[PDB]
């Protein structure tokens, strides 16, 4: 049940799509093994890093 609630946030944050499969956000995030992966994933989007 809690896992299914973790899916609710993972679907809302747009990492995995609503049909429960991985998107580009989820793909890029798949490389990061650290615990603070979601913010880090969100850091790479725009030219802010450039």
């Amino acid at each position: 049940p809690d896992y299914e609630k973790r899916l609710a946030v993972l679907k809302d944050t747009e990492f995995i799509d609503q049909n429960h499969n991985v998107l580009l956000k989820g793909r890029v995030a798949c490389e990061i093994n650290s615990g603070y992966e979601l913010v880090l994933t969100e850091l790479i989007l725009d030219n802010f890093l450039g």
Binding site: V28, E31, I44, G50
Partner: protein, 49 residues
């Protein structure tokens, strides 16, 4: 030193992901960082050979 090592691990992890996403400049930057931080005491000899 540990922190620096883990940063090397990160830059590696992000490098792949950077490539995957697309931005080549970003990848280069990651690998520029990966060039500079890997040296001397940070990655010294493993004295157990």
């Amino acid at each position: 030193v540990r922190v620096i090592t883990w940063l090397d691990e990160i830059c590696r992890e992000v490098k792949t992901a950077s490539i995957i996403i697309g931005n080549s400049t970003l990848h280069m930057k990651m690998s520029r960082a990966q060039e500079l931080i890997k040296r001397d005491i940070v990655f010294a000899a493993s004295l157990y050979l």
